[model samples]
Target: NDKEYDKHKRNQQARAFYHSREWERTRLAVLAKDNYLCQHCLKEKKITRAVIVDHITPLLVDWSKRLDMDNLQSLCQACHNRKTAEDKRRYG
Candidate 1:
């Protein structure tokens, strides 16, 4: 019970930081660097406009890498959601 609470509390904190103005700036930069194209789609030989700027590595797993440009990529909602599900199945 305590662990669940701690997990959720920390998730909230992480979400807060992710949406912070400073992080938004980096998010925008990532999108710019990728030309608003989904990196996953590009690798898969498709062209897709990206809306979400995602971390290649889960933020909670390695907060030390937060805001690292190399750890970020532009992703469409479809790809980003799929990646989230895959990461959860593997790491959750």
Candidate 2:
């Protein structure tokens, strides 16, 4: 119960951060820089449109790198989910 509540609170904060103007601008820039394609899929020779601009290093681990272009990559939903799972397993 406590864990779920904590997760919910964190999710709310994260959602707010994502909806902020600064994050929206950075997300757009990353998408354009990646040519609107999923970088992971491109490397695997698949053409997929990316919708999520992901941080190379998890923001939870390194807040200072949150808006750094070099720390970002564009990923399709599937790739983003996989990376998220891996990060949770590795870090949590």
Candidate 3:
């Protein structure tokens, strides 16, 4: 029950952040700044389309950097998932 409640709370927090005008504007700007390309894939010498703006340092870990453009990067679904898993493994 506690785990589920925690998950629900996190989702609620994330929902609010994702639905904000600031996030919308920042996400679009980051995508454009990165030319709609996955920064991770690019670094690995692979080309991939980006659909999400990711926090270089997770927003939950550093709330103050939540809307910092410099802390954001454009990532495709695959790269984003991979990175998230890696982070969870390493940090959590």
Candidate 4:
């Protein structure tokens, strides 16, 4: 699976970033700031628990905002997956 292998290679640097102390703290703080709820859901008048802190501007898209709190938003797994796919579609 060269595709899978390539993904792992591409993500090696990002994998480290996610494991970093700063990103860990930032994720938790983003969740807390959003009250542990999916901000996307709230905007649509739905309430949902969120544990994923998504980057509004992807790290690869805009490296400058990689750790910017203002560029972070709490998203449920579903919303996160949707956002991830959306970004992939555009980038690909």
TM-score for each of the candidates: 0.85, 0.79, 0.82, 0.82
TM for candidate 2 is 0.79
Candidate order by lDDT, decreasing, is 1, 2, 3, 4
lDDT of 2 by residue, 45-69 (tens): 9999998899989876666887899
- What lDDT is obtained when candidate 4 is compared to the true structure? 0.87
Predicted candidate 1 versus true structure: per-residue lDDT over 4-92, tens digit per residue: 99889878878898769979899988888899999999999999999898888888887788889999989999999999999998788
What are the per-model numbers of colliding residue pairs?
A: 0, 0, 0, 0
lDDT at position 90, candidate 1: 74
Q: Which stretches of candidate 2 lie over 4 Å from their true place?
A: 1-15
TM-score of 1: 0.85
lDDT of 3 by residue, 46-84 (tens): 999998899988876776898999899999999999989
Which residues of candidate 3, in runs, are more than 4 Å off? 1-12
Better of 1 and 3 by TM-score: 1
Q: Candidate 4: where are CA atoms >4 Å away?
A: 1-11
